[PDB]
Amino acid sequence: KNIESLFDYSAGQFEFIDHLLTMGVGVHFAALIFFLVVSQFVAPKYRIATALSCIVMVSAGLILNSQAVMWTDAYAYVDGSYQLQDLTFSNGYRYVNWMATIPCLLLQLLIVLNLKKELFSTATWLILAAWGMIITGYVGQLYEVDDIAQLMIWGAVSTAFFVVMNWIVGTKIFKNRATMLGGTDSTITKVFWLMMFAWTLYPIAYLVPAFMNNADGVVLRQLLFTIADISSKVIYGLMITYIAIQQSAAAGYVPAQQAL
């Protein structure tokens, strides 16, 4: 059902996808140690934001690791090219995992924004819009080989949820940044633009079967996911952590003031 299963891969292409995924694991588990150790320097009001990055690191790290092992299980070097064997490789597992990682990324943003009834109501609408976007995207990617028109349609429905979700995010950011301490009102605007850039890479990767239906396209989609994953989880995570420690320090939390 996926474009990955259509082609044989050169040693170069196969190895590069393997390296990308393996690097992904490395980066997320390395970042996982950073967030764990710096969590002691975050005040109790914001400590869950740092804990959420740890959850994200392990979740994304486990899926990338599963993808890497599935990649190597599925293909073998036969007559000069990596060819598909008994098992299959699919990007479908990422979609399933986004059901958990996307709410996590959104929740840590809400915490550093100083959201408190307001927090539960905003989290529910965000998670429902996020699940709507993920589910419609998952259905759409089932047709990336058999029905391009269907991929485009479910993609349009997914984009509508993405846009409304982004509008909720931006509205809350640009409204609640005045509550933010230690000059983090400036930082949070950059986090908004970082999310807009990084999350927009996922629907681009989704559209790869439409404009680059070949093995090089398979490499590109994995490259795009790698850039997007590192930017949206790791880089985003580090900015959320800085915002949490800076605000904690401005709020009189001694470990944060000493660590800075």
Ligand X SMILES: CCCCCCCC/C=C\CCCCCCCC(=O)O
Note the residues at the interface with ligand RET (CB under 6 A). 60, 98, 101-102, 105, 133-134, 137, 140, 155, 158-159, 162, 199, 202-203, 206, 229, 232-233
CA-to-CA distance for 36 and 144, rounded, in angstroms? Answer: 39
The residues facing 76 across adjacent strands are 83
Give whole-number Cα distances, 145 to 55, 90, 137, 151, 152, in Å: 33, 12, 14, 9, 12
Instruction: Collect all residues with Cβ–Cβ distance below 8 Å to 166 and sequence separation of at least 6.
Output: 196, 199
Contact 205, 217 (CB under 8 A): no
- State the number of binding residues for ligand X (CB under 6 A): 28
Query: Residues 2, 8, 18, 36: which binds ligand X (CB under 6 A)?
Result: 36
Q: Which of 37, 44, 178, 211 binds Cl ion (CB under 5 A)?
A: 44
Cα 118 from Cα 256, distance rounded (Å): 27
**Span interacting with ligand X, options 9-17, 47-55, 61-69, 249-257, rule CB under 6 A:** 9-17
- For the four alpha carbons of 185, 191, 196 and 199, in that order, the dihedral sign comes to negative
Give the interface size with Cl ion as a residue count (CB under 5 A): 6
Pick 49 or 239: Cβ nearer Cl ion:
49
CB 170, min distance to ligand X, A: 20
CB-nearer residue toward ligand RET: 35 or 82: 35
Q: Which two tokens stand for residue 78?
A: 């036969």
List of residues contacting ligand X (CB under 6 A) = 12-13, 16, 22-23, 26-27, 30-31, 33-34, 36-37, 40, 150, 153-154, 157, 219, 226-227, 230-231, 234-235, 238-239, 242
